[PDB]
Amino acid sequence: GSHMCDAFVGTWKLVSSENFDDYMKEVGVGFATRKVAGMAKPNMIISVNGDVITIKSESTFKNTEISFILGQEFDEVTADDRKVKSTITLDGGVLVHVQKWDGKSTTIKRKREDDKLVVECVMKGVTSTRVYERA
Numbered sequence: 001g002s003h004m005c006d007a008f009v010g011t012w013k014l015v016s017s018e019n020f021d022d023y024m025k026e027v028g029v030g031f032a033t034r035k036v037a038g039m040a041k042p043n044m045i046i047s048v049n050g051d052v053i054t055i056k057s058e059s060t061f062k063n064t065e066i067s068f069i070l071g072q073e074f075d076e077v078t079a080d081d082r083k084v085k086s087t088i089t090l091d092g093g094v095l096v097h098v099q100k101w102d103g104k105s106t107t108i109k110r111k112r113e114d115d116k117l118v119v120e121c122v123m124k125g126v127t128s129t130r131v132y133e134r135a
């Protein structure tokens with residue numbers, strides 16, 4: 001039956017992006033990829049099937065897909081083509097996604113707030129806020 005994270009399940013569309021270009025600079029994304037990725041307005045599709053959660057992006061830039069079990073580390077290739085080790089957990093209602101590569105790590109936290117899904121992307125001291133609403 002249902003689970004708390006069923007509040008993330010559905011189809012979402014990006015409506016607000018703040019400081020993403022500075023986040024991508026901290027991550028190390030090069031110029032052309034920053035400009036083309038920063039223009040994108042991806043939809044995000046989140047589904048659950050038993051213990052397996054799947055998060056997809058769909059856009060004019062890249063379509064990405066990850067499927068995972070909470071707390072169980074996996075391999076991920078990101079939209080900017082980094083090969084990372086990822087682990088996703090739930091901390092009180094917040095989906096916390098840690099990506100590690102080449103000695104660096106970034107954390108992407110997804111939480112519901114009103115009718116929005118608010119995504120905070122953190123790399124060292126730079127934070128980007130990406131707000132989605134239901135599509």
Ligand SMILES: O=C(O)CCn1c(-c2ccccc2)c(-c2ccccc2)c2cc(C3CC3)ccc21
Pocket residue numbers: 024027029037040042043044045055056057058059061062063064078079080108119121130
């Ligand atoms: O919601 C966010 O934006 C954070 C997670 N994330 C996504 C994404 C992932 C799943 C669903 C919807 C968007 C993209 C993304 C996917 C497709 C097209 C454009 C961007 C993304 C790109 C980056 C650049 C690597 C630095 C960092 C985090 C990223």
